[PDB]
């Protein structure tokens, strides 16, 4: 009855009001306390909705909104919930006037498709004509999303990492970008300006012997660099739980001394049969295995995670061999050079496996001076990989940041009087719902949201219908067109789509039955 359409709107506005101040480049951060005691600080609504635990089914619909929005796009996940909250506020005033909920839902559906046709005519092309012009606007496009993070310090140098990473994993004919092809990686210590891009998988490993060679030589023009991935170490077999082998007489005592002594070279000679240089295993090696592989310049790595072995086999075209009898020359890794490069004074001393030819996958390399700085830099660059994916898929792009919501709101109010239907009330509410985004952003920038909204509407009439920048980005003035601020069109189209469809499903539920827990 009456209590159905009331408490649902009031509870949705209270939950969504938390991320309203967090949407923007100036948006305020939050403190999310994990159940283990760790404190996390992020301004993105995707982590907030996942951290918030509540039994109300009304707010769970907003959590599921950012779930499908993050996997499909991963950009407007914070703004898609705030935009959906504006439709619920305008619909609440229409319910008191006697308008049916389906009439409100049908009014937002017809106004959504009408606003897409008006926005589709104003888009511009980037990758068209000169191809170098695409990377020109693409280089400065990633700097906009990095202004709300500590990355904004060095962001000028960090903008080239996301641009060169997508080019190697994508072909102009295929135009396919996958987030699994780019492995997230970060390291603590040093400086952030030392982060570069690697053309292949790069792990952090330490050699068991100090005198092992840090560089792998081609050994008189061999074919690539052969790398073997096995699940068993090369050494006399020993149990990993308890040993306890009692010997009764000196007979078996002298036998086991000769046997195990001969098993030292027999396990190492298996490497020379396959002709492999770097040997990666799950378990460590004995002292003799480190001495025999030292004279042959065959570095070995111990205690490697199981998940890290899959990334090496994809890039180097390797295989996982269970034992030492199943090895062959076709299962060995393929790479140009393997070397251990030292970074600054850090004692980590990672290893770099290069390629020098185009592969289907790359591995990013990020450094940081503190724990929270590394986690913030990884998430800041994660959203940058989502922006470059939508720009290469659709050449047509539209401006954003509060300019598009004002332009799209003007075309709805004009066509509302021509319909002469009942949805005309929902059309004006849909136009005011789009005006909530620039008003919400203006509250985070320290400006009057009413005066800023009226300013954006007045300057788009007597001048031109083109988008006009907003002071919320902290730049010198408006008109982002001169500052090369570009947002993806498919990202904004899916943002206004799922947000409108979610508001319809809320009105379609007139009863909420909440039972106990088992």
């Amino acid at each position: 009855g009456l209590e159905a359409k009331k408490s649902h709107i009031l509870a949705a506005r209270s939950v969504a009001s938390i991320i309203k101040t967090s949407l923007g480049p100036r948006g305020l951060d939050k403190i999310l306390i994990s159940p283990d005691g760790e404190i996390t600080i992020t301004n993105d609504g995707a982590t907030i909705l996942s951290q918030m635990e509540l039994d109300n089914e009304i707010a769970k619909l907003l959590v599921q909104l950012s779930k499908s929005q993050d996997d499909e796009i991963g950009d407007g996940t914070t703004g898609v919930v705030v935009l959906a909250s504006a439709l619920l506020d305008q619909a609440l005033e229409l319910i008191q006037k006697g308008i049916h909920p389906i009439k409100i839902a049908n009014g937002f559906d017809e106004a959504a498709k009408l606003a897409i046709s008006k926005l589709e005519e104003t888009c511009d092309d980037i990758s068209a004509s000169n191809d170098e012009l695409f990377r020109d606007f693409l280089l400065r496009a990633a700097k906009t999303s990095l202004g709300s993070k500590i990355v904004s310090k060095d962001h000028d140098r960090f903008a080239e990492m996301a641009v060169e990473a997508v080019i190697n994993v994508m072909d102009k004919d295929r135009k396919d970008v996958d987030f699994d092809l780019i492995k997230m990686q970060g390291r603590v210590g040093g400086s952030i300006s030392d982060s570069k891009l690697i053309n292949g998988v790069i792990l952090d490993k330490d050699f068991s012997h100090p005198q092992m060679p840090k560089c792998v030589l081609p050994k008189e023009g061999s074919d690539g660099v052969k790398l073997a991935i096995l699940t068993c170490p090369f050494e006399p077999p020993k149990p990993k739980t308890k040993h306890k082998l009692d010997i009764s007489s000196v007979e078996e005592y002298q036998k086991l001394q000769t046997y195990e002594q001969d098993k030292f070279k027999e396990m190492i000679d298996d490497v020379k049969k396959a002709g492999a240089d770097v040997v990666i295993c799950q378990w460590g090696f004995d002292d003799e295995a480190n001495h025999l592989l030292l004279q042959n310049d065959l570095p070995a790595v111990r205690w490697v995670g199981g998940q890290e072995l899959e990334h090496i086999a994809i890039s180097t075209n390797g295989r996982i061999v269970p034992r030492f009898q199943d090895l062959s020359k076709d299962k060995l890794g393929t790479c140009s050079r393997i070397y251990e490069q030292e970074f600054g004074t850090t004692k980590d001393r990672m290893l770099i496996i290069e390629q020098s030819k185009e592969t289907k996958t790359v591995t990013c390399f990020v450094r940081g001076s503190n724990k929270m700085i590394v986690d913030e830099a990884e998430r800041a660059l994660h959203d940058s990989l989502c922006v470059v994916r939508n720009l290469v898929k659709d050449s047509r792009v539209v401006y954003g940041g509060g300019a598009a919501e004002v332009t799209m709101s003007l075309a709805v109010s004009e066509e509302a009087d021509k319909q002469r239907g009942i949805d005309q009330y929902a059309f004006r509410g849909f136009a005011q719902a789009l005006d909530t985004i620039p008003m919400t952003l203006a509250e985070n920038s320290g400006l009057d949201p009413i005066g800023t909204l009226s300013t954006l509407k007045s300057k788009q009439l007597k001048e031109k219908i083109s988008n006009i920048g907003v002071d919320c980005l902290g730049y010198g003035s408006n008109d982002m067109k001169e500052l090369f601020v570009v947002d993806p069109f498919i990202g904004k189209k899916q943002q206004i789509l799922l947000a409108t469809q979610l508001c319809r499903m809320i009105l379609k539920i007139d009863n909420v039955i909440i039972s106990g827990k088992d």
């Binding site: 006037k97 109010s413 021509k418 005309q424 009057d448 009413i450 005066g451 009226s454 007045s458």
Partner: protein
């Protein structure tokens, strides 16, 4: 401090909640129980606010708005209260957006002034020289009264009385120029328009009273004929000074202290054939001093010939127990267009409601004299202004631009309330009128429903300062 302003808005909006139900002839009546225990009922909006005995002073201002609405336009006292509550309801959401009430008050200044210029554009100018337009306007405006049959013949009689104050050049047009006097006897269809002042009192009923005189002088005398406080000699000397000035008609102010004129003085003036009209109320004193151009005379030493008036014929006409006294032939340079209308009827309840029905007919004509032109009512001017301000809101700048949108939405309560009180569907009628509004403008003309412009003009003007004076009060302190 917002708790005072928030309470003033909620208390004021609660007033118009019951007013929206009584709007229109089909509206719902409201119950009012006086402190004395008397139970009254009616649909009049001004009557509700009069007997409501409002305590809070801010809500008492709505009574002064309805009082000034009837004192000038005479119609629309119910709609002006609803229009005020609409601006207060929209102003409540303005405070939640961080808007200071001073900007709200300053925004209503340009909103009310520009609404007048827009209202003149849609208005169709008329002319007072056309009598057919004034008769049909007053006749159809009486459809709210019990008797429709006798309302048609009174329309041309009310227009001919205004033709004297209908002159082109004019400044102050007051309804006091036409004095409505009710009398017992006769019917409604019988009405006569006198060219001179007519009082409500009869003449001397004793023996010797002439009751009629030709070529008589009439003047205001505040004196009182009483024995000195030999007695007939003092009363005769007062009459001797009047005989020297040849004053045929005397007027004595009504005084409840002592007797007005002694019976011995009435017999003395009966031989001289001097007519005396007693029981003169204070309201009729200011009415006689204007048209006749006479002067009030306090004492007997202040009585002179130059301070009296001039009358060609003074007679007492008695039709079915009437005994009305009329005055004709003023012939004075100070005379003005004073019109006297005699109302006749059988029952007392007839001449009461019929007289009050003619006041509203004169107010509608008064609206056309002050501001020429008429506009078809029924929600046409409210929707026309609300739509044009929606486009002008996009051309504004600053905080006011959001107020222009909310100010236009506050005007939609008038067409919505009329649709609800008539039983029709709210949303269905409002969306249907706005649908054809893109082509038709004022199209109600075939139904002969016409609302004068001054009602729509005063509704915006009075509600502009009303809502302004409310939000400007930030607190209320006890002062004694």
């Amino acid at each position: 401090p917002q708790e005072v302003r928030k309470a003033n808005i909620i208390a004021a909006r609660s007033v118009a909640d019951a007013i929206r139900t009584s709007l229109g002839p089909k509206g719902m009546d409201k119950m009012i129980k006086t402190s004395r225990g008397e139970i009254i009922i009616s649909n009049d909006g001004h009557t509700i606010l009069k007997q409501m005995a409002i305590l809070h002073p801010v809500a008492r201002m709505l009574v002064e708005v309805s009082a000034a609405q009837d004192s000038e336009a005479g119609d629309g006292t119910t709609s002006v209260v609803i229009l005020t509550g609409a601006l207060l309801g929209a102003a409540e959401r303005l405070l939640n957006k961080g808007i200071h009430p001073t900007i709200i008050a300053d925004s209503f200044q340009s909103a009310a002034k520009r609404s007048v210029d827009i209202l003149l554009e849609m208005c169709h100018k008329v002319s007072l020289s056309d009598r057919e337009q004034l008769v049909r306007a007053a006749s159809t405006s009486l459809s709210s009264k019990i008797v429709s049959q006798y309302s048609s013949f009174l329309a041309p009689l009310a227009v001919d009385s205004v033709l004297k104050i209908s002159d082109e050049n004019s400044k102050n047009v007051d309804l006091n120029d036409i004095r409505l006097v009710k009398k017992v006897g006769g019917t409604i269809d019988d009405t006569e328009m006198i060219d001179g002042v007519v009082l409500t009192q009869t003449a001397i009923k004793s023996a010797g009273g002439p009751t009629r005189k030709e070529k008589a002088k009439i003047g205001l005398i505040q004196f009182q004929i009483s024995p000195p406080k030999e007695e007939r000699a003092y009363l005769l000397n007062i009459c001797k000074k009047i005989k020297k000035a040849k004053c045929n008609v005397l007027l004595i102010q009504k005084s409840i202290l002592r007797d007005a004129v002694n019976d011995l003085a009435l017999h003395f003036l009966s031989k001289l054939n001097i007519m005396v009209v007693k029981d003169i109320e204070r309201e009729e004193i200011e009415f006689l001093s204007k048209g006749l151009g006479c002067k009030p005379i306090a004492d007997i030493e202040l009585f002179t010939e130059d301070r009296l008036g001039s009358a060609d014929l003074v007679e007492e006409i008695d039709s079915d127990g009437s005994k009305i006294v009329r005055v004709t032939g003023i012939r004075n340079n100070n005379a003005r267009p004073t019109v006297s209308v005699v109302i006749r009827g059988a029952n007392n309840m007839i001449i009461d409601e019929t007289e009050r029905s003619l006041h509203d007919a004169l107010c509608v004509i008064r609206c056309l004299v002050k501001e020429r032109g008429l506009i078809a009512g029924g929600g046409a001017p409210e929707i026309e202004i609300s739509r044009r301000l929606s486009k002008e809101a996009r051309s504004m700048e600053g905080v006011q631009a959001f107020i222009w949108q909310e100010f236009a939405s506050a005007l939609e309560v008038i067409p919505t309330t009329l649709a609800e009180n008539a039983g029709l569907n709210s949303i269905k009628v409002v969306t249907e009128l706005r649908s054809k509004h893109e082509n038709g403008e004022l199209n109600t003309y075939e139904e002969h429903i016409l609302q004068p412009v001054l009602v729509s003009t005063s509704a915006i003007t009075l509600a502009s300062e009303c809502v302004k004076s409310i939000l400007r009060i930030d607190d209320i302190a006890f002062s004694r």
